[PDB]
Design a protein around this ligand. Structure first.
Ligand SMILES: [Zn+2]
Ligand SMILES: [Zn+2]
Ligand SMILES: [Zn+2]
Lengths: 499, 86, 250
């Protein structure tokens, strides 16, 4: 008919003839097409779907049903491709399956379906519903698995992963990450794993970490990765700081003679997830106390206005044990190094002497004795090896490991559910803060809104960060009530006022 | 005998600016500088003038001078130093 | 009558109906007076009450500074201020609602501005969001309380902004400079909105402090902000080969 009206009619009536040849031939019979649309989409037949899409695009209002059917098909495909995951390797295979689904369906849309932007939007919505498969009222496993995936593929591992493979894998991964709609949880988890990986030296390369931070910044913004980039910048400037401290102690008047290979990791306080939550007062050993004093002098001289909060649960170092013949040198945390120095003070040592020599709390202390006994570094002279009132124990002479650099700590992974819940609570607090900011900004802008419009505009404003709930919002109004910043309207409880 | 060879340590730096205080000496600006706190008999207690930058940060003149003899940057904010007052 | 309201301030709960009933008498007797129907109530009870609550809260505020620092002093003052709003509501005439609270403020927060203003620096600088929302609502009522927090927030934003736009890398200076101001702007718009009621006297303190950092010039040089923000437009409005989609540019 197109070639016929081209060869017979005027140019001005090409579209109108085709428009009446479609609005009465595939739009009056639109119900049959829409009924077969679900089957023709779920079967995934290429040419038939292409012709179906062309005909529905010709119809003015025949395409969105195909959009909904395709979106439901992608949702079902993603759910059946992501709900069969095992616990053997979840972070890798989850993102790999989502990448396979996304790549296959982008190829399907772009090749045999014209690459319509509406279909890409439907695919994006379907994958947003897929990866955010909230197990009912329990968890949201997507951000944690994505953060674990980044940690696993950025950690220095002996399995074998070249730089270029990691870079292209992260470039692919960003497509999965773009639709998580819980990015605060992922930000906090990636900050925690980045802190652990940078401090403990588990990064394969600083270039990989900088590239990943750049990818996340391009995905979300500079405000998303500001803390991560400050962490990376501090870890890069740490070498310059160590060099400056060595130059400072070489240019003093007298010979300081630290006696230890001091290597400090001064971190910015506001940009790191680390905190002094273990508020136990730790007694620094004297040979480390000299180095602490000298670095306090340096960081009060070459830097001004900065107080230096010492973290004694991120610190580690090598200690020698030449008492029994110097078999090896042990990497050890400073908490355990304190009680090793107390062992050096006296071979026969009790728990009270440990308490008066370390001044630290009983829970962290008991953890140190447990983490020393499980590696059979020490033996308990009492009847029972666990904790008790007396707790007298001396050095073990039967430790005969074959490693010349044997390490007695392995707390590089941790991820205990208590600190996982603490991280989630920090996310919840930040979410509450953002919702309070949005509520106060909207009220200051307008001063008169209803409840449903307020909820809708909060969802629209905070769409790019998380998916806030009604109870959290009402808690934010309650907090502003307690701070006398908000009030509901006197005429109706739906509207709101200002104090 | 246990001998410690390495003490790879982690510390958090945070800003500890208190009101009306010289950041280099950690003492009040109207008081004498810590460089002039020693040999106070020789010091006339008058040459420790309060120097203000264009960033509205106040130190003592001797402290900011000794600071500028090493680096030309303000400590509290990492910008270059311009005197505006004395 | 002052004794069983002072006893109410001490913790015990007397008969609310009896105290309110006797107080209502001094204003219900005068209901047939065409001129000044509260002149009896404002001299028999209210003037002794405002003096009684003046010499009591002066004693209480001086009793709180001995065993409390500025962080929890405002928790106690806000606890007394909120209680006094409830206490005068169920005891006094509605005309004396404002006079009791305003005289309470003039004995706790207004007489101790110098204690609150000296500690107002550490509240702003360390970004104590809980204490900053207490120093605000205490100094908001006092006429001359805010103009020192406004200066201390402007000094904090100017120092935070200058530190954020310091020693940027030459490779991406046009983009680092804009995003460094926007994270300072973004952090303090939210901080003012959540904590400081979204006050315009503080948003102007932010705008007067972000203007100084943006227009900060190196020694014997010129302000590079117009040049840097000209390149930031140029950097993202070119044909970006790597990313930078149409929706991100707008
Ligand atoms: Zn000084
Ligand atoms: Zn001096
Ligand atoms: Zn300065």
């Amino acid at each position: 008919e197109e070639i016929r009206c081209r060869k017979y009619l005027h140019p001005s009536s090409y579209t109108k003839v085709i428009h009446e040849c479609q609005q009465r031939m595939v739009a009056d019979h639109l119900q049959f097409l829409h009924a077969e649309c679900h089957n023709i989409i779920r079967q995934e037949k290429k040419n038939d779907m292409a012709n179906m899409y062309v005909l529905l695009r010709a119809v003015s209002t025949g395409l969105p049903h195909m959009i909904q059917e395709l979106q439901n098909h992608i949702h079902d495909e993603g759910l059946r491709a992501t709900s069969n995951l095992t616990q053997e390797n979840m972070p890798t295979l989850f993102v790999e399956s989502v990448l396979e689904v996304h790549g296959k369906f982008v190829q399907l849309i772009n090749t045999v379906l014209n690459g319509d932007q509406h279909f890409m939007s439907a695919l994006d919505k379907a994958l947003t519903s897929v990866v955010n498969y909230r197990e009912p009222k329990s968890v949201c496993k997507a951000p944690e698995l994505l953060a674990k995936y980044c940690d696993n593929l950025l950690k220095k591992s002996a399995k074998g992963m070249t730089e270029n493979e990691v870079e292209d894998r992260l470039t692919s991964f960003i497509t999965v990450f773009k639709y998580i709609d819980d990015k605060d949880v992922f930000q906090k988890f990636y900050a925690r794993m980045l802190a652990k990986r940078l401090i403990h030296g588990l990064s394969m390369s600083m270039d990989s970490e900088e590239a990943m931070i750049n990818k996340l910044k391009q995905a979300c913004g500079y405000e998303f990765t500001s803390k991560l980039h400050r962490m990376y910048t501090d870890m890069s400037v740490s070498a310059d700081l160590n060099n400056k401290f060595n130059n400072f102690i070489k240019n003093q008047d007298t010979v300081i003679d630290l006696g230890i290979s001091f290597q400090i990791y001064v971190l910015q306080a506001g940009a790191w997830p680390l905190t002094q939550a273990p508020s136990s007062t730790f007694a620094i050993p004297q040979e480390l106390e000299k180095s602490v004093q000298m670095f306090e002098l340096f960081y009060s001289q070459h830097f001004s206005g900065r107080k230096l909060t010492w973290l004694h649960y991120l610190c580690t170092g090598e200690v020698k044990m030449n008492y029994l013949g110097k078999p090896y040198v042990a990497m050890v945390t400073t908490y355990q190094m304190a009680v090793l120095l107390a062992f050096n003070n006296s071979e026969t040592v009790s728990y009270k002497e440990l308490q008066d020599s370390t001044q630290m709390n009983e829970k962290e202390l008991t953890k140190t004795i447990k983490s020393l006994l499980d590696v059979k570094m020490i033996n308990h002279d009492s009847e029972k090896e666990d904790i008790d009132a007396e707790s007298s124990f001396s050095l073990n002479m039967n430790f005969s490991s074959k490693r010349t650099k044997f390490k007695i700590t392995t707390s590089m992974q941790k991820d205990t559910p208590q600190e996982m819940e603490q991280t989630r609570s920090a996310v919840d607090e930040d979410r509450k803060m953002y919702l309070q900011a949005a509520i106060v900004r909207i009220m200051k802008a307008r001063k008169v809104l209803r409840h449903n419009a307020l909820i809708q505009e909060v969802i629209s404003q905070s769409r790019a960060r998380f998916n806030p709930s009604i109870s959290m919002i009402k808690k934010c109004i309650e907090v502003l009530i307690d701070k006398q910043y908000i009030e509901r309207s006197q005429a109706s409880a739906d509207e709101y006022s200002y104090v | 005998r246990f001998e410690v060879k390495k003490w790879n340590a982690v510390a958090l730096w945070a800003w500890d600016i208190v009101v009306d205080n010289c950041a280099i000496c950690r003492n009040h600006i109207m008081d004498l500088c810590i460089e002039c706190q020693a040999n106070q008999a020789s010091a006339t207690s008058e040459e420790c003038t309060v120097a203000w930058g264009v960033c509205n940060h106040a130190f003592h003149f001797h402290c900011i001078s000794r600071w500028l003899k090493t680096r030309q940057v303000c400590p509290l904010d990492n910008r270059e130093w311009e005197f505006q007052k004395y | 009558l002052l004794r069983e309201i002072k006893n109410d301030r001490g913790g015990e709960d007397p008969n609310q109906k009896v105290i309110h009933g006797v107080i209502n008498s001094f204003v219900h007797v005068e209901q047939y007076k065409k001129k000044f129907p509260l002149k009896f109530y404002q001299e028999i009870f209210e003037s002794p009450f405002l003096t009684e609550t003046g010499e009591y809260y002066k004693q209480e505020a001086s009793n709180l500074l001995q065993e409390s620092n500025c962080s929890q002093y405002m928790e106690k003052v806000l606890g007394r201020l909120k209680d006094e709003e409830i206490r005068c509501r169920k005891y006094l005439h509605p005309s004396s609602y404002t006079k009791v609270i305003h005289e309470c403020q003039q004995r706790m927060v207004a007489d101790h501005l110098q204690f609150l203003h000296a500690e107002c620096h550490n509240i702003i600088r360390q970004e104590k969001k809980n204490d900053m929302a207490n120093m605000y609502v205490l100094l908001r009522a006092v006429s001359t309380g805010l103009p020192h927090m406004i200066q201390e927030l402007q000094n904090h934003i100017h120092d935070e902004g200058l530190r954020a736009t310091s020693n940027l890398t030459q490779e991406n200076m046009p983009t680092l400079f804009v995003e460094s101001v926007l994270e300072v702007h973004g952090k303090f718009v939210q901080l003012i909105n959540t904590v400081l009621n979204g006050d315009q006297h503080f948003m102007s303190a932010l705008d007067k402090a972000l203007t100084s950092v943006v227009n900060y010039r190196e020694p014997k040089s010129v302000c590079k902000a117009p040049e840097l923000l000209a390149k930031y437009c140029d950097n993202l409005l070119k044909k970006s080969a790597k990313g930078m989609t149409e929706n991100e540019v707008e």
